[model samples]
Target chain A: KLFITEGYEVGRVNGLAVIGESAGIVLPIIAEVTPSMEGRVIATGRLQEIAREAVMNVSAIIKKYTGRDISNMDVHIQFVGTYEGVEGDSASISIATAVISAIEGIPVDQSVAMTGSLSVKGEVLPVGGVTQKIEAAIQAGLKKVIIPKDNIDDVLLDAEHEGKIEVIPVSRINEVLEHVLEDGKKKNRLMSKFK
Target chain B: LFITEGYEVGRVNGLAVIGESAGIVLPIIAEVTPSMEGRVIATGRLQEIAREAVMNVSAIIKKYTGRDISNMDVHIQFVGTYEGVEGDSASISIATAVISAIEGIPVDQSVAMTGSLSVKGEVLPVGGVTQKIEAAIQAGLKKVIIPKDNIDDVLLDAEHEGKIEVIPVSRINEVLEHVLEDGKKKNRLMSKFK
Candidate 1:
């Protein structure tokens, strides 16, 4: 059976925007946008049925990496939650991170933020929308952003605007939080000026 | 929705192109002339699942007519495969189709177009201005019809006197004035499409 999929599964809350798609079916909305950071996750199953699982899996990864309960954190998570029709599994982690950021009060770059699916064992999986999400975030005036560690290269390519916005790459949720929040004083000073 | 109108013709050559929605009109075709000579194309299939369907329709028109259609017009549509949503690209397709129909021109056999066919026969913009315009330019077109709101993107991107001419339009009558009028150069081949 030839099934075709299109569009992204997105959720927006507070100031966070979460987007994702099926493997190859949906473009890597976040990973490509933040290549300098983490790896992209590849989902092998259907997206709609497993979307909640993806969210939970991402939450677990955030807790493992950040050493904090993301849901309890004080941040606004703009959840571009799962769309009605899509087919990737990797976006789970990224979506979780965005959710964590919102729940935990972490101030992700207003312009850009992302989430991706991850293995419960802490393996960095490939995700989608790495490029478009970043571009969208940047277009909205965010300079300091965060992504999975594997996606660092995506951020580096467009690093010309790095000085304008802080692009932090991470593997675990803690790395993202620490770099995005704590590192702001020293590394993100340039970004504040542009804002 | 509220409706308005405007007109554009080749001042030097007498060719012209007009439409109701500058947003919908802009990125579809590259050149506008007083008469129809080429076709418009469409391509992108992004958030709007219906985009590909619109392109299919665009291709159908090009198949029947002998003209050049831009890809952006097909891809950058507002409608999707949403329930009870067959209007978005249908209107755009109709406008372009009508443009050809009114001007007594032929469309390219391999192209497809789609858009909502307005009650008063106007076109409107969809999503993704940047990508859509690029698609039209890449398709090798001469004139682009656009809605007024989307003019900014074209204007800013049209830096350095680019080859493409972006014309803002607002109503169906303007389109008739631009494509159906008679002229040796300005009306038939000049301002409409390159």
Candidate 2:
């Protein structure tokens, strides 16, 4: 009810988060940037502290690696619709991807959902609940689920979900964009800007 | 080094916790000078809340003390080399340091305090009350000030108990009365508030 899983959107991403201990759902995120006098990240949704830190951590990498310094732009992030449960910034990779897609004006594939944390060095850090998170993506009828390379073995899909969705493992932020962002000279242009 | 015995003009010992298990004596220093266009600046690891501490304290200072901070540039420094020393509990310490700096009154270096100050002169309760008190004791300070509502939250082992006096304050007036040194200058400043 909260995400578009068929088309492409510039600054929107379908993220996964666990509900309670075993269930996961698609937590969509949207990001926007505007020139401001003093640069700051503003995130609005329930559990704002976690979302704010998630955006801040992504902001550093967007500037340091991508070389698109947003020091003069106010970044706004929204955790769209209603999302509950205990999963916080464990889906920070989604936040980072959303911001980058918005910054470069690149539309990410809406059919793919991801879960992982992003490091300032552009590494995709591992997070928990890959099994249930993948289940959530499969239930949402998404085409693929991207997870951390370190969490590859953590995915415990049963018979039904085993081949329902093709899972992509990413070791770096560049690899994530390589798989999800639509193919074009523009994608290659932004892809080379990263390491 | 950090203050322990003698009074300091604009320095205050603020107690903060490490994670949730232990505590340390964090120090704060404030310096203000006349300026044409004044701004409140706070410097340290967590400047987001560090600078916010100054803004919250500024409202109280200007409201009660009738201090024209608009004409004074305020510089707040969270002294020492520490990381993640959140500035929320350091509110009163920053307030006290700035107040002492502007009034030219010395603060008792032996006193360490922790609490969030409501701009309306209320001493709001904060986290890590027990750990903060133990920190004040280990720092060898004579007294530690905390929120009056946190009186029952003070839990110390038999060995740590009675080593230091814990002063519970409900109003900002109580905090100033205990930490500010005695003299006509201090008296004149205290008279401005109820």
Candidate 3:
């Protein structure tokens, strides 16, 4: 509750432009929709040290769009992933998406899941286990999904999750944010949903 | 080539008989090295063959012992210990010794020789000197002749076996003269057995 209060208060103060997070076994305690929902996406980070990098990157993003340095940005960091060693491409995308969601003040549905290997070029790259993650999203009552374009075949092969969850393949992080937030911005062009 | 003509023939044959009565088959052949031919044999059992070979020699000694011969312990031994339980060298050595004995050539009893002989009379070098020393020491031998290449390997970890001595030679004539004629012998006498 305290984490949600802090996240809501921080999101309100920053105009809710982005919600950065990490990866671990536990899901994020705070999301953009924290006032009504209790849990958010899973964050991945081995130690508190990794959170430092996430915060640094998030602060940079806040400065770029908000025209000011939110160096001391009090954003919620969550740990989520499977029991397997979690730390890699997926965490990169999750951090960027969380930050973007928070910065835009866009309420991301707890069911809408996103994961990819994020690059400094603002592009989303393929990560492993697309099939399993898509299945997990559908089972969790998520209506839509966002994944790297390169992983489209992997998710498509899993016919059970074909239409069960609205899958959107994207090559960049901005495409993911635009689709999930329904915001109108040139930099936030939404990707076409998979038919 | 040393030319000792009219020498009597002393031949020891059979696998168990030759190996036991003389030494095991340890032959080195020209197939492996040009000048060297036939396998070499080594072992303490050479002493037994020496005893048998010298048994006849002892009879000859008795024929000339003007006095009672019972006091003499006629000894027999191959030139060197044949090793590895396989080779024809001991057969050659025993054959040579027996021939020398029968001919009364008075060959150097202190000299040792080992090699293999074929039915076609081809000589061969025997392998494995690292083991035959056992029989040499047991036979109470002083001087042992082996292929020059085998010297280091034969003496690798060997301690002196009794008054046992080691002499390594590559050529057959070198072995013949050293055992047949008197000469400054080459070979170290080990002090203890390991």
Candidate 4:
């Protein structure tokens, strides 16, 4: 029920989800990381296995790019108010964005919503319900949406929903941060490390 | 289709469902070997429950053996190629097979078991008690071990009642005490759980 369409927030991102078969909703996710004796990824809800696998896949990228070892940190991911419970690993990019924002202390653009799965080698994978997800982001009054580059041909928007939201196609996780992260020295410094 | 009548290491008879009402005896074998990292490799349609069962029993295994199982690879094989074998009723049988494999002990060829397992070493009740017992009886097994709580669920007919002994177990220690081969190795392993 809560959708933020303005301003920036750290560790918070708007994720899209499909309800039943046709309808879609804005699913928000929050992430927090802490020091731990042993590295652990703690997540709740029925879609936790998908979350765990997402974090595992993203950790490889986080370690390679930032030189930060996630094995000694306890990563916590919360799917805000998921009553019917989420399914599928389509929220992989949202989870990666939230965790990176939390770990780097960088703010994320609330005007942008994203939905795509992540690969262990930093590739952005396509997901199902692309058209329904875009409609949900439009309904939430979001300004931009990030989807997989391979899913460019799958979007079929109606007359009213067209031209209302900017659809950005991405092929890597770095491209996502470039569009969603706030502009500053920290962003530049982190962006340089990946290159 | 394969049923053995002699003692074997790392092997146990596990009963499961074929369809809605019929039951079949599913044989399981376990193998433990040193590895770079700890992992459980299970194969079959029911491998998810097999992994969960191994995770639950690993707690008891570490406590009793004082060995870090994380440095070893545990492999569990479902002997026959049967589809739609679901549920955690075979947890006790898997646990027994793994323990026997790790301890280098043999399991009795005449006993079959069915029950769910808890992380704290408790044997929990399961479904299809009568059908499982009937399958064990039809396999010409001498005994069938089930959860103590499931004793009331066993509604065997007069023809199958006296054919086999039903040993009800309430804990992992009880199941280990019954199926594991009797010797110095079994005695030493049982003493740790006591």
- Per-model TM-score on C-alpha atoms: 0.31, 0.51, 0.35, 0.53
The DockQ value obtained for model 2 is 0.02
Off by over 4 Å in 4: A1-195, B1-4, B87-90
lDDT of 4 by residue, B25-57 (tens): 989899999986788898778786677667556
Off by over 4 Å in 3: A1-54, A80-91, A182-195, B1-194
Error of 3 at B4 (Å): 87
Pairwise DockQ winner, candidates 1 and 3 = 1
Q: For residues A2-50, could you state the per-residue lDDT of candidate 1 as single tens digits? A: 1102222122111223344411122222110111112222222234234
**Model 2 docking tier (incorrect/acceptable/medium/high):** incorrect
Question: Pick by lDDT: which candidate is best?
Answer: 4
For model 2, residues B27-71, the per-residue Cα lDDT tens digits are 766667665367765432444665677777766788778677778
lDDT of each: 0.37, 0.77, 0.40, 0.80
Best by TM-score: 4
DockQ of each: 0.02, 0.02, 0.00, 0.02
TM-score of chain B of 1: 0.39
Q: Order candidates by TM-score, high to low.
A: 4, 2, 3, 1
